[PDB]
Amino acid sequence: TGLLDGKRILVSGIITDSSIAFHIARVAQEQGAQLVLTGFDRLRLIQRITDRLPAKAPLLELDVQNEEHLASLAGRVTEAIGAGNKLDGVVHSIGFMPQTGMGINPFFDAPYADVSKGIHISAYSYASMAKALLPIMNPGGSIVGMDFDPSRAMPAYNWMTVAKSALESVNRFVAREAGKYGVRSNLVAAGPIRTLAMSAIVGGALGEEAGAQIQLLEEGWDQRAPIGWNMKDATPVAKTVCALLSDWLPATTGDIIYADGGAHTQLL
Amino acid sequence: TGLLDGKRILVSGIITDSSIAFHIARVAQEQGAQLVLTGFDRLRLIQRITDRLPAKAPLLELDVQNEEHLASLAGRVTEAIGAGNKLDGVVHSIGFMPQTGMGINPFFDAPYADVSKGIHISAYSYASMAKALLPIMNPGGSIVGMDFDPSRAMPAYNWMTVAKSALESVNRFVAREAGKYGVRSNLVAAGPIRTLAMSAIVGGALGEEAGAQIQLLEEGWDQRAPIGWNMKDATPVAKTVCALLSDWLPATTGDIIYADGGAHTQLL
Amino acid sequence: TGLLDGKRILVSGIITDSSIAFHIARVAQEQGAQLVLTGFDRLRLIQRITDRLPAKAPLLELDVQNEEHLASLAGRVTEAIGAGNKLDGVVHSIGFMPQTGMGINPFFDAPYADVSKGIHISAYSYASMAKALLPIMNPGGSIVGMDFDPSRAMPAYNWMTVAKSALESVNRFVAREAGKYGVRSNLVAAGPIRTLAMSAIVGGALGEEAGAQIQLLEEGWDQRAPIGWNMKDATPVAKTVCALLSDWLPATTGDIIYADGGAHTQLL
Amino acid sequence: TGLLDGKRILVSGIITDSSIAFHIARVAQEQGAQLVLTGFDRLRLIQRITDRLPAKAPLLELDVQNEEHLASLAGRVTEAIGAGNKLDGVVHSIGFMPQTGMGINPFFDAPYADVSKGIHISAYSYASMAKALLPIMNPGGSIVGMDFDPSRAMPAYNWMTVAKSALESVNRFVAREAGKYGVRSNLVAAGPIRTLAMSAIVGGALGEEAGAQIQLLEEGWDQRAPIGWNMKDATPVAKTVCALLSDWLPATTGDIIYADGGAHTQLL
């Protein structure tokens, strides 16, 4: 029997097979979950990518900044899962911060229009997806979002760290609302993962200094982590999301679970 | 001798004599500081209010959402303090969250345009003011912002709590930039204060439930505070800001000082 | 298939069928784990209680304050599980604070001899058990301890809260040592549970005031928990421990998982 | 006028002129405080050291593990300050952890007798001095203890980090008790300071590895600190204690003020 047997789970955030959501989606399918997938912009590309998952799943378009996509979401999910059925899980694996607010651009040089777009996609949309999906979720259900520990400041992350701090606060309010439906809301704070944006910065796309800074963060993370940290392996992160989606953490809500090799609990 | 003798300090946030900034400005002046004041919108009203302070101080217009006011700020401050002079301190006592994002309106019913405006004024502007003023600040200088503990969710505060969570993260990045100038950046987390907006909610402006919830927050705050908490007295908060503006906390930066009667350290 | 199929798990802390450890042991067994149980003092009583579990399990004597019991632990466990076999998990569900240090006695009136005994059993023993068992634990293994959120002070808990603060720090160092063996170390922060000591205080054993204070803590806990909190149900806590014992949280170490209905994330 | 003008302050923890308490005592005297000093064991040595302070002050013997020294403390202080007078400040700058629980000895190899002595001196004694001195403290008074951030584990510190975690919890309970007297209780979390024990470990007294670990911690601290960190300068730490002893932080209790150059707010 699978960890997610009989559970209907919506998974957002798939762009490539390197996406954390792809690995969440693959592990949930191996664990017997029935998926509904959401994608943004490059729908032709994600269709080809989602065809690489172990099982077939409906693919729905969802731009979190689009009010019409959100207003129709619940109805579109119902048509995909069939009338009389509700979701048991929701995975928010969405984030974006323009290069003006994250990378090499000075912290003070990020224009608010760009910071605002980043906070809309990365923090406010966790509340927006919860508003749209809670009326179609079963009691005992679970909403999971992806977090990057923003308790301490660090180089390059800049406005993304601010957006993550806003997301942590949003998660605590979403828990109050979701609790009325018997639904839990939690964040998984993952260690750094070699996704396309991460591979670009380490590889030198943002220059020598930025690459050296992220390489130092990765090296230090693995050193600090009592059990080590492998940036090239999204599996432990995907497994943690599936633990939260299961019925095995039923008294955890408005919380953060750290899937970071324990690096945040160690100074040196 | 005064705690702030010979120091040039910019104080933003004065609207009425109930404003936390008014009490900070009054305590700073009693302590021998030379002030520069900034005000938004009702300049005629704030001129009459600033005439009630113990000493005369220049009043400059500053709308934090206005890029032209920001771009000219340093130049306008220099003309008020005199050429060759720099500020030893900056007080950010600015906050705003539309009623759609704070109050009786459900957490999910706040439109992003309103949330975005609130975060711009309440969080991003701490960075925007630091960007404008750091080139005109002396080493040993101090930037102080006002916060309301957002570590745990609570009724009615809603998107303001999300804005305060974003501000705490902003302060940690401001500290990195300000450190290059030998300047400290900190937040003062005050307990609830009976300012105009607070007096309105307790008084019943937002209805029976909202008034009851805020009364319960206040009552509980005073109960958990080992030294109690007087919501009608802004002096202990003003004194704490002045301590951070002084040379008496010289190794504290990117941090939060709680002027809350110790309420946050107690469960019951 | 069970969540804990094929895993050998040591479970300490059983005294009655109300013990949190009893519910952890019962859930682990339903999930296909092979248990080794440890008990203190009343072995005849605990044998009768352990006979009430779904499956038979060896019972070993372990007084954590007894260096001879500690020195022989690994050898005695090996004889119970069979030569060539190792443990996949350890559950530390042990705690004690004399009434001078927890209850109605003023915080200042607890003698150090009593405080010291409480910290030995409640905090130091987590490290002492990890020292004794790590040489007989498999890579991928898990050590779990029971905690009660000590981040904020509260009435009556007194020196137990100080012991829990020490335990949280111990867990972070245990993680460093356990990481060398590929073993994770975590704490489960449970909400209040109606165990024998808890039922006594609520029931009036320590007088009118102490009973009223604990009733107020319980009532408030259920109020702040977005998903509520049932003090008479240890199952959600037992399930959370089993999640940490499983392979489903493999990148979490030196950490705390809150099985508290989300109460700690909410102010009111 | 001085920051501590007219204030009677008890300062414990002077052993050499490198002691953090020596610098607290020197700064408080420059700020016009009237001191009462306490010393342990080497009274002849501390007399010669205390003679190097800017002003004369009574020296009282105080071993925190000695019940008779604590029972007579208040009476002995009254005789030194004169009948009819009370203290306005108390500085706890005491700490000890045997080499078995801090340094090169493995974390698991510290015997409880040694850990217990370390917790008695470093954590329990903060409560013991508060019990003895609160009946002779004025309203508006302040108790300050020295802390080393124990939120994250680190090499060598070992059981001292555990004792500091216990101290942080003790401080929160002492605040509840002190609040009944109108007295605040806070901790100052200092960055690393080149005291005799610190100079010995960096210098190589505990071997090559331990020296390299502490040198790395110091180097990293200064790097992480937005305003830098000078381990050879206790003045910023002494100034922070004097800020807490003053009337300038009157609504802060059961709290921690970080005098660490802001290093704890930055990851890298």
Ligand SMILES: NC(=O)c1ccc[n+]([C@@H]2O[C@H](COP(=O)([O-])OP(=O)(O)OC[C@H]3O[C@@H](n4cnc5c(N)ncnc54)[C@H](O)[C@@H]3O)[C@@H](O)[C@H]2O)c1
């Ligand atoms: N090191 C890391 O990669 C790292 C670390 C911790 C947490 N996280 C978080 O995990 C999540 C997934 O990130 P990832 O690394 O897999 O990156 P990714 O690029 O693979 O996924 C991010 C996704 O956000 C989607 N998205 C962006 N704007 C959108 C919009 N307007 N509407 C809908 N979807 C939109 C993109 O299409 C993409 O699928 C993010 O929230 C990220 O911040 C990442």
Ligand SMILES: NC(=O)c1ccc[n+]([C@@H]2O[C@H](COP(=O)([O-])OP(=O)(O)OC[C@H]3O[C@@H](n4cnc5c(N)ncnc54)[C@H](O)[C@@H]3O)[C@@H](O)[C@H]2O)c1
């Ligand atoms: N209980 C409380 O009142 C409480 C508690 C903790 C922290 N705080 C924080 O303290 C600060 C001051 O609040 P207050 O209670 O004195 O309220 P206030 O209304 O007296 O002051 C808030 C100020 O923000 C200014 N402001 C708003 N929009 C602006 C803009 N675009 N440009 C520049 N200034 C603008 C207003 O003119 C006003 O002077 C805020 O950051 C608030 O969040 C308040």
Ligand SMILES: NC(=O)c1ccc[n+]([C@@H]2O[C@H](COP(=O)([O-])OP(=O)(O)OC[C@H]3O[C@@H](n4cnc5c(N)ncnc54)[C@H](O)[C@@H]3O)[C@@H](O)[C@H]2O)c1
């Ligand atoms: N509300 C609560 O009950 C609550 C809340 C959160 C966490 N916890 C923690 O959970 C754990 C289990 O508590 P419980 O509520 O099940 O109580 P319990 O009394 O049922 O179990 C505590 C156990 O500690 C054992 N113990 C005491 N001294 C010992 C010694 N010297 N050697 C070995 N074992 C010894 C006792 O025999 C008993 O089995 C403790 O660590 C407790 O602090 C309890």
Ligand SMILES: NC(=O)c1ccc[n+]([C@@H]2O[C@H](COP(=O)([O-])OP(=O)(O)OC[C@H]3O[C@@H](n4cnc5c(N)ncnc54)[C@H](O)[C@@H]3O)[C@@H](O)[C@H]2O)c1
């Ligand atoms: N890097 C550091 O040095 C560092 C960093 C942060 C915090 N602190 C803390 O600051 C405080 C002062 O430390 P320090 O560095 O000045 O060291 P220190 O050696 O100069 O002072 C420690 C003092 O504790 C006293 N003491 C020990 N046992 C005692 C007993 N039984 N009774 C009474 N007094 C006793 C000693 O006599 C000594 O005066 C300690 O609590 C320490 O942990 C130190």
Ligand SMILES: Cc1csc([C@](C)(O)c2nnc(Nc3ccn(Cc4c(F)cccc4F)n3)s2)n1
């Ligand atoms: C927390 C995190 C790490 S990578 C990630 C997402 C969802 O892939 C991103 N969303 N928006 C991003 N924008 C930018 C702009 C520049 N980058 C590269 C970059 C990184 F990928 C990581 C750190 C710094 C950095 F500059 N990434 S990266 N989120």
Ligand SMILES: Cc1csc([C@](C)(O)c2nnc(Nc3ccn(Cc4c(F)cccc4F)n3)s2)n1
């Ligand atoms: C942290 C805080 C408390 S009062 C405050 C400011 C600066 O006065 C505000 N800035 N924007 C505000 N917007 C609104 C909307 C509704 N209110 C009233 C209100 C309160 F004043 C306090 C709590 C809840 C609440 F609804 N306040 S109030 N900020």
Ligand SMILES: Cc1csc([C@](C)(O)c2nnc(Nc3ccn(Cc4c(F)cccc4F)n3)s2)n1
């Ligand atoms: C954290 C916690 C809650 S109940 C618990 C244990 C393992 O049952 C205890 N271990 N030692 C205990 N000692 C005492 C002394 C007095 N009590 C009763 C009591 C409680 F059970 C709970 C809160 C306060 C209180 F006074 N409990 S209770 N530990």
Ligand SMILES: Cc1csc([C@](C)(O)c2nnc(Nc3ccn(Cc4c(F)cccc4F)n3)s2)n1
């Ligand atoms: C927090 C801190 C740093 S130095 C300090 C005190 C009060 O001077 C100490 N109290 N007891 C101490 N015992 C030991 C045993 C060995 N040392 C040297 C040493 C250090 F001084 C610092 C880190 C590790 C280390 F091994 N120190 S050091 N407390």
Ligand code: NA
């Ligand atoms: Na109170």
Ligand code: NA
């Ligand atoms: Na509730």
